[PDB]
């Protein structure tokens, strides 16, 4: 009955508002309306902030109070002045101006700031150099140009004297402004040159007796012009090169702070906090919005294959160069990445080996080395020496695959059950892929742009354009941008190229768009380090011991996944929270689900 | 009502062929604020130096507005304030101590030599720009020397002593019943908003950065009082707005205003502060994303006046003001600077471009939809409906100016 | 300069051009081009305000005054000529060197004006003290716990946010700016003490985005009273507001209400200030339903006229429903009366109500 809701409206309201401290304010607001202090429309507007989401409830409340939908909007900035203060006079205000202009209402910073002041936008260390240079530019430019405008003013004067008779010369005083348009300019220039105060009786002499003063003042002003210009030219070289060293850094707000923010936000912790944050959102609303609990909190997509041969050859370079990993073990690190990738992403291994082989060219027998063999050292030497019961399906959601009755016969869909140190190794793999791919998507536009840019003829005849990178070769003039970015990165891990020179080359080549490729040397390192954990940590290796068998299985029953899941759970401690990485072969779609089940 | 859309190349509209009038007073470059002050009136001279070398003087009509009198300056500012401006000089600062506190002059807005003359160049420059539009002589007026939108009735704020825009608008208001003012400087145009807040004859649509950024006014709820309720429109943007997002906000709002409140004239204050790299402003607008604002307002076909306003990095603002002067003359300029006296400034590629930075765009489409929704809710209420006056004397400056700016040096 | 006006001018002065211009000397070349080249007695605080400003200093004693504070105020343009003394020093000089015992001087004053006698000493004393700025005596400010005197003598309340340390505003690394969290700080989307995520109230989500894609992240701030996190999008809000005053979240009761009477145009209600704990009197009325709280309430779980009425929650349900049902009856009455009224203004009704069914 309609009575049923009303006798429970406060109960329904109490549940949604949640914490009592917010419910009390909801009661206080409801009080003010019943005390006739608060108008009905104001009550409904305030209740909106409480019960806005529950549309079925808020609509009922709006129905109950009788709210009907379809000045005092003063604003916070402006305050009214009294009538008396508006009388301070204006000489030239027409009758029209009085109606239009505003005199009563006023607003000031000291009131809008709440007297606590403002925050100015922070600027770089380098962007504050272009500001020091700008002022040094203006200071020389202001004095010289203000000096020229006097030169022309006096030059037309001086020629007039030599036309006039000497007797005439006696009486040719100049009104102030020397007849020029500006009365003030010619004073600030003479006062600067002629010693401050002494300069004042020059101007009086210039007016009272110009015939003998103007020729002398013009002479010196030209002489001071020549000295000032000779300095600027010498100062032009200092300013031009300094602007060249620190310009492209000034634009780069995110690139400078990236190297320190990468190691802070790419860690085992935040990669789990990030994925968990999406899981709680889908379940929180379940509490309030009633969202169903879905699979695959995190979704990735892999549109381009050739990035995988690009990442592998990058990590191939680092592994060989690295001094930390012992030489016999490095062969497993190289052979882990090729096999794991060739297994997870369906890429044929032989295709990968040619890609590495060609990259080796740029600079004797293969039995079947399973990834299962790689994960155990004992079996590795042999291929180195050679050339649960009564457990029904209850969850349903965890194992995505309920496709077919009994046993699914041919499924593209494949899920990898993972520890923390497997998922992190996989997030370090996508992180490179996301950073690399967005470069290759720009590669067609950027490659054309780099070639077609042309030197201005007025800057090539003179020696103005920076030639530092062209000598070093770090300008993508001769090659496509993306393939060049790789063979620059390959030099970064090799140590041949200094870091500040690698970065600056991508600043001019990509206009600062590609700032994420500043830690391609370190992210590659961390990926290798995590991949090393997979061979060691024999608990974790046993997980991918099961995965390889499952990924090789074409026909997996629904219960088989549960068998696969439960065995994997046995190897983790009851505290650790396993992940589910799910792969769709047809659509190269990888979806990660966050699991913290029993 | 905010639909994110990628930026499109600026295209010139052949339908409109406006005959521009350019106001350049050669002296306005020779005034300097201080030893380290951000406002540098040099930027007008370079922005004019670039213009003459593109040969834009072949299309425009060069004018030198007669400087504003002491009386005409008072039709907005109180007689006490203007009288203080005339006498005040750096040597006279000791004599004036009560005034210098009462009138916020000489501490952040310094008392530089020639304070009165420079202000007198700004106003006659905008005022006459309105006077020529009224007579029908020009469909556009370009007064980069002026545009100082921060000054108040009896106070000098934000580097702006004489608020010329109010002087300019009052001149338009004598012929056009309704005038629209559009602000694209990163700061809130409090000088013009506070002057026209009560009247409905002027709508002051201002885009700015809110969040305790000077002057810390212009919140979304400020919509005027009295008759001028809903006739004020503030769009408080957040940090790091960029080319594509700015267009998706500027164009829909302006298109709504010129439909519901049909203006007879527009005063568009092309602020330089919004551009990327400026020392005091925090947006990520590039030239193409900034000059597109001018091209949109021009396309409507109603007489407008373009005022320079504030620009704090001489290199960037001089480039965009030259490009905007190109669009008004129906010519898209080539991305190759021509030789000019101030050539060493525009490093390092020496091209006419202001390069957008890398900073993180924070305005979010969920936020921008809520701001643009409230504005459209309000705008549905704004349905349409020695004195010299109409100072007209202009001076025909180009004969004198052609040898300036145009360089065959080698 | 000097010159036989008929003859040539003697050159003014050799220009001592050592300007120390922002560049080192305007005429001087750049120096060494090492970087930038790729190849190679009276107090200083007003005795009245206790603050700074332009002062007018007493001559006898080390006490300085503003130009406005001293009574009567003195124009900065026009000042008394010669030496000046504070009203205290003028008193001592006044007393001293004439009828010197104060008593006799004061004994004449009390005898002079016998009507005001009860105030006689207070009037005489006021001629000796220097001008002062009014400050509320401590026994008033101590009554209200919330209020406290600021650095400048300001009224500072519980609403005013405690000032940021000057180091925090201007001394930060470039990547992280404390004042504005506009650089993708993800540790905002975490509760420091408990470790759970902060969840917005409007959308019941936290939008912490990946480090791969930070544009999926939406900014979140927390109330200063409630501590209920809100997106900067849900409450439309331009920025964090960490300077001016504490940000009152929506969802917190009003402390000041402007009610239009709909017939002065308006009535104002302000919540009673919080009194000191001991002087406060909490009262639970005997009447459950319909007590006039006047807006001051403490929610019971289930001359001091400043008494906070204590109301049961079940009472608010009855009050709110009582108000609603009465208005609905009145609204139905007026509508029904008006329809009946047009019948009242009405030989034959011809209302066609019989046809209606």
């Amino acid at each position: 009955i309609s009575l049923n809701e009303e006798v429970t409206f406060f109960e329904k309201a109490k549940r949604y508002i949640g914490n009592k401290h917010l419910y009390t304010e909801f009661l206080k607001i409801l009080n003010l309306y019943s005390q006739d202090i608060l108008d009905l429309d104001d009550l409904v507007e305030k209740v909106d902030f409480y019960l806005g989401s529950n549309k079925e409830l808020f609509t009922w409340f709006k129905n109950f109070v009788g709210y009907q939908e379809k000045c005092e909007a003063f604003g916070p900035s402006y305050k009214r002045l009294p009538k008396s203060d508006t009388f301070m006079p204006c000489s030239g205000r027409d009758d029209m101006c009085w109606e239009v202009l505003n005199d009563e209402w006023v607003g000031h910073p000291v009131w809008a700031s709440e007297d606590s002041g403002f925050i100015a936008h922070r600027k770089n260390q380098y962007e504050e150099t272009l500001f020091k240079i700008e002022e040094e530019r203006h200071e020389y430019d202001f004095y010289i140009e203000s000096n020229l405008r006097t030169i022309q003013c006096l030059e037309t004067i001086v020629n007039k004297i030599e036309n006039m008779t000497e007797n005439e010369k006696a009486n040719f005083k100049l009104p102030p402004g020397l007849g020029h348009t500006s009365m003030t300019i010619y004073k600030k220039v003479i006062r600067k040159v002629y010693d401050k105060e002494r300069g004042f009786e020059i101007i009086d002499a210039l007016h009272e007796h110009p015939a003998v003063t103007a020729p002398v003042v013009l002479k010196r002003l030209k002489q001071k012009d020549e000295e000032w210009r000779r300095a600027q030219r010498e100062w032009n070289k200092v300013w031009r090169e300094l602007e060249q060293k620190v310009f492209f850094k000034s634009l780069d707000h995110l690139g400078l702070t990236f190297k320190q923010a990468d190691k802070k936000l790419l860690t085992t912790k935040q990669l789990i906090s990030e994925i968990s944050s999406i899981k709680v959102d889908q379940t929180n609303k379940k509490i309030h919005w009633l969202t169903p609990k879905p699979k695959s909190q995190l979704d990735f997509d892999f549109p381009d294959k050739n990035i995988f041969y690009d990442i592998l050859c990058l990590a191939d370079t680092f592994i060989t160069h690295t001094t930390a990993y012992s030489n016999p073990d490095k062969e497993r690190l190289k052979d882990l990445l090729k096999y794991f990738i060739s297994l997870f992403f369906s890429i044929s291994f032989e295709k990968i080996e040619e890609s590495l082989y060609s990259h080796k060219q740029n600079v004797p027998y293969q039995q079947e080395m399973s990834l299962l063999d790689i994960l155990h050292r004992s079996r590795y030497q042999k291929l180195k020496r050679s050339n649960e019961a009564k457990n029904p399906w209850l969850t349903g959601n965890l194992v995505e695959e309920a496709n077919s009755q009994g046993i699914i016969q041919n499924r593209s869909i494949f899920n990898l059950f993972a520890n923390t140190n497997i998922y992190i190794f996989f997030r370090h793999w996508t992180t490179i892929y996301e950073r690399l791919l967005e470069i290759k998507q720009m590669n067609e536009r950027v490659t054309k742009e780099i070639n077609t840019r042309s030197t201005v003829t007025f800057a090539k005849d003179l020696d103005l354009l920076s030639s530092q990178l062209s000598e070093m070769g770090l300008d993508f003039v001769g090659e496509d941008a993306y393939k060049q970015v790789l063979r620059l990165s390959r030099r970064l891990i090799n140590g041949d190229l200094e870091h500040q020179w690698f970065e600056e080359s991508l600043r001019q080549a990509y206009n600062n768009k590609a700032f994420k490729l500043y830690t391609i040397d370190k992210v590659t390192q961390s990926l290798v380090k995590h991949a090393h954990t997979l061979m060691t940590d024999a608990k974790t290796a046993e997980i991918m011991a099961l995965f390889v068998k499952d990924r090789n299985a074409s026909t997996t029953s629904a219960k088989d996944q549960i068998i696969y899941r439960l065995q994997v759970r046995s190897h983790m401690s009851n505290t650790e929270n396993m992940f589910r990485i799910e792969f769709d072969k047809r659509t190269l779609h990888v979806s990660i689900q966050y699991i913290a089940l029993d | 009502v905010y639909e994110a859309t990628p930026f499109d190349p600026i295209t010139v509209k052949p339908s409109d062929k406006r005959r521009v009038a350019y106001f350049y007073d050669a002296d306005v470059g020779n005034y300097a604020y201080g030893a380290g002050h951000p406002m540098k009136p040099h930027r007008i001279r370079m922005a004019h130096s670039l213009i003459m070398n593109y040969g834009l003087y072949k299309k425009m009509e060069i004018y030198r507005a007669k400087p504003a009198t002491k009386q005409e300056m008072c039709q907005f500012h109180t007689d006490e304030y203007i009288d203080f401006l005339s006498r005040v000089t750096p040597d006279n600062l000791e004599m004036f101590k009560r005034e210098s506190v009462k009138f916020n002059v000489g501490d952040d807005c310094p008392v530089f030599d020639g304070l009165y003359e420079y202000c007198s160049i700004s106003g006659g420059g905008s005022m006459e720009g309105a006077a020529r539009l009224n007579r029908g002589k020009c469909d556009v007026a370009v007064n980069y020397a002026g545009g100082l939108h921060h000054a108040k009735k009896s106070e000098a704020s934000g580097f702006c002593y004489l608020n010329d825009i109010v002087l300019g608008i009052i001149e338009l208001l004598r012929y056009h019943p309704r005038v629209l003012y559009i602000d694209i400087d990163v700061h809130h145009g409090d000088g013009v908003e506070e002057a026209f807040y009560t009247t409905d004859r002027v709508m002051t649509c201002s885009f700015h950065k809110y969040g305790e950024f000077f002057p810390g006014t212009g919140e979304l709820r400020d919509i005027g009082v009295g008759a001028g309720k809903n006739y004020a429109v503030n769009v408080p943007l957040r940090d790091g707005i960029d080319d594509a997002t700015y267009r998706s906000v500027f164009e829909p709002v302006i298109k709504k205003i010129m439909e519901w409140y049909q203006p007879s004239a527009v005063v568009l204050q092309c602020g330089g502060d919004s551009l990327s790299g400026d020392r005091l402003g925090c947006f990520n607008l590039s030239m193409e994303g900034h000059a597109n604002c001018v091209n949109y307002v021009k396309s409507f076909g109603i007489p407008m006046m373009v005022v320079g306003g504030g620009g704090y990095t001489m290199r960037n603002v001089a480039r965009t003001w030259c490009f905007e002067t190109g669009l008004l003359n129906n010519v898209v300029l080539d991305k190759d600077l021509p030789y000019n006296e101030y050539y060493e400034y525009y490093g390092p590629d020496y091209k006419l471009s202001v390069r957008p930075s890398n900073m993180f765009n924070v305005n979010t489409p969920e936020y921008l939809d809520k701001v643009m929704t409230n504005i459209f809710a309000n705008l549905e209420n704004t349905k349409y409906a020695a004195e010299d006056l109409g100072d007209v004397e202009e001076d025909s400056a180009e004969a004198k100016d052609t040898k300036g700016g145009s360089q065959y040096a080698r | 300069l000097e010159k036989d006006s008929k003859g040539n001018i003697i050159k003014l002065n050799e220009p001592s051009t050592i300007s120390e211009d922002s560049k080192v000397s305007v005429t001087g070349l750049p120096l060494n081009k090492g970087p930038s080249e790729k190849i190679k007695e009276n107090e200083d605080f007003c005795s009245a305000c206790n603050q700074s400003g332009s002062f007018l200093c007493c001559d006898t004693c080390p006490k300085s005054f503003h130009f406005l504070c001293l009574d009567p105020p003195i124009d900065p343009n026009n000042l008394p000529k010669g030496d000046w003394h504070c009203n205290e020093c003028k008193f001592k000089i006044f007393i001293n060197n004439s009828m010197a015992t104060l008593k006799k001087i004061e004994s004449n004053f009390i005898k002079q004006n016998n009507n005001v006698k009860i105030f006689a000493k207070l009037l005489f004393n006021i001629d000796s003290h220097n001008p002062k700025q009014f400050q509320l005596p401590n026994y008033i400010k101590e009554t209200f716990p919330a209020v406290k005197t600021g650095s400048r003598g300001q009224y500072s309340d519980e609403n005013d946010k405690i000032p940021l340390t000057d180091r925090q505003l201007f001394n930060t690394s470039y990547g992280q700016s404390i004042t504005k969290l506009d650089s993708y700080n993800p540790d905002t989307h975490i509760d420091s003490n408990s470790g759970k995520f902060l969840i917005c109230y409007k959308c019941n989500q936290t939008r912490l985005g990946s480090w791969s894609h930070p544009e999926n992240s939406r900014l979140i701030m927390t109330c200063d009273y409630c501590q209920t996190p809100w997106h900067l999008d849900c409450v439309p809000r331009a920025s964090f507001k960490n300077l001016g005053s504490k940000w009152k979240c929506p969802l917190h009761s009003p402390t000041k209400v402007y009610k239009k009477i709909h017939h002065v145009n308006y009535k104002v209600w302000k919540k009673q200030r919080l009194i000191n704990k001991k002087n406060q009197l909490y009262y639970e009325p005997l009447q459950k339903i319909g007590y006039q709280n006047n807006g001051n309430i403490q929610i019971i779980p289930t001359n001091q006229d400043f008494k906070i009425t204590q109301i049961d929650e079940n009472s608010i349900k009855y009050d709110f429903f009582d108000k609603i049902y009465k208005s609905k009856m009145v609204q139905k009455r007026k509508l029904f009366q008006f329809q009946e009224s047009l019948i009242d203004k009405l030989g034959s009704q011809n209302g066609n109500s019989e046809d209606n069914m």
């Binding site: 002041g117 100015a120 | 916020n104 | 009276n42 332009s54 007018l56 001559d59």
Partner: peptide
């Protein structure tokens, strides 16, 4: 009489005025 001086000439203290004398 001798009057010291005021060091700074504004009521805002330049905390609310840009290019502050006292706020950068």
């Amino acid at each position: 009489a001798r009057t010291k001086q005021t060091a700074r000439k504004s009521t805002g203290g330049k905390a609310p005025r840009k290019q502050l004398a006292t706020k950068a």
